[PDB]
Amino acid sequence: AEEFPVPNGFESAYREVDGVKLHYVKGGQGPLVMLVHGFGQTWYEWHQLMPELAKRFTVIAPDLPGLGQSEPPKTGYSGEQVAVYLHKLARQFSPDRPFDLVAHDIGIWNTYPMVVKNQADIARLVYMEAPIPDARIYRFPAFTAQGESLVWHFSFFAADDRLAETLIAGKERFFLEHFIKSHASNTEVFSERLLDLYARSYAKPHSLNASFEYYRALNESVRQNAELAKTRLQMPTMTLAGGGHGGMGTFQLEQMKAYAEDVEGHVLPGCGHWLPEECAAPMNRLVIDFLSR
């Protein structure tokens, strides 16, 4: 059965890529746009964007390996390894023309390498609410004068001994609610049913582990990206970031400027980290307009 409700006119389906059965939800007609979710979530965070975007594009939203209904990666969880699966998946549906990429949160981590290495395959790029893993992440503070910092979980999740799985097991719903809301400006959008759905999904033991394995591979991703970044991105790029509590603000664009030649950026006041849910209407509009140019 489906973990999340599929919007009318879309199909939930699977493709094997490099021996890994990936789940995705797909609909629309026209050139391909792939939407990639991040931590704590699945394809479903894009469910409000999808029907609108489907009016002009074929839309595909995969579950990251090990998350949602996708199988764990057989290679590893570093960005360069995971990006392979997402690239090949996109190419099954757009073998003959470039496709657009939209990524949120660790979806960025898991797509940047395939973008920079296959630039001819990427027409336009939208990145929102996560740093590309580089040495900038080592400057983020453990603790702040206002208390709990925004990224202390980097260390919690990266820790060995399965620290995170062990503490969070049986308390997935409680932990996820805290994590989402502490990174949100608009908390009201996360209803009990929505949180139930997400918690149920990432609580599958292989998915709870998959979640943290992305973070255990984070330093490897940074090292990979140090080499990859020698080539700047040449395709038109737009960044989005929340300007409210939990958001990344000016960091998103300012980082991307070091990576891309052709970038525009927006900061959305009153919005936190979870842009597609906290601020669906302006986020959708900005993405649709940027891609429809």
Add this chain to the structure above:
Amino acid sequence: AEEFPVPNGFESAYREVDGVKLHYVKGGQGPLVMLVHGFGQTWYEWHQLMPELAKRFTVIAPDLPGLGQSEPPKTGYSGEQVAVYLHKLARQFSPDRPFDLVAHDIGIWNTYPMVVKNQADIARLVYMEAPIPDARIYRFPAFTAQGESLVWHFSFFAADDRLAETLIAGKERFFLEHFIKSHASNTEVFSERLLDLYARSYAKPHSLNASFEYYRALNESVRQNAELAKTRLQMPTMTLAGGGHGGMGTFQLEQMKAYAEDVEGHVLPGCGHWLPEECAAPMNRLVIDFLSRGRHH
């Protein structure tokens, strides 16, 4: 009942201070030295140092409010509030003479205010392995090129909704072993037996909660110390830090130089955060020698 074995010729006792029953272990004879433990531990971390000190000093090792066998504080958990309990306790056993102070980890947070506010009561001072709460702690990284950073737990522990209690309760022994060993260079000293003793103590629900309340009061302690630090410490001071994995390295001395006029520091190689256990011989020697420069025996 005793959570930890009391060394021969020491007494385990309790003292009511401002409505709070504080547990302590005491022995020896001579001028007073108070030893103040930190997070994850109790008076017991000092148990190898104590019989050696007791040959030259009256030694007292209290359990911090809410930890070990001490009741939670009734005022609050900021450094300034908790310091009142420890200062009054010490002064009961040394009402007419200054005493010595040795503090490890959050023992520092909980003693600094009474040291700076009662400088004449403190003859000599030894601080090891924690920052004094100030704005420097806002500069420590959440994540490092080597993996989990050394103070990410500050935010974990300080988070609202009782995040840390809810996640950790029932898994106290697991968490502690990871926490201690990840902050250690010499991990081998933390036997399963020793980890069992410590975990048993902080698994007491009021103790697990008290542990975190110290971090929930950290910003307040930072604000308190900003005022208090306008006057430097005048008594002889020594800092110790671990040079190995989990230790604070040169940070300890460098921060202290901003706080004290008279400070000598040591960084112990091959030792991490838990100096009394990981590096017992050199640490004990450094502490005994430093305190023995003054009146004793």
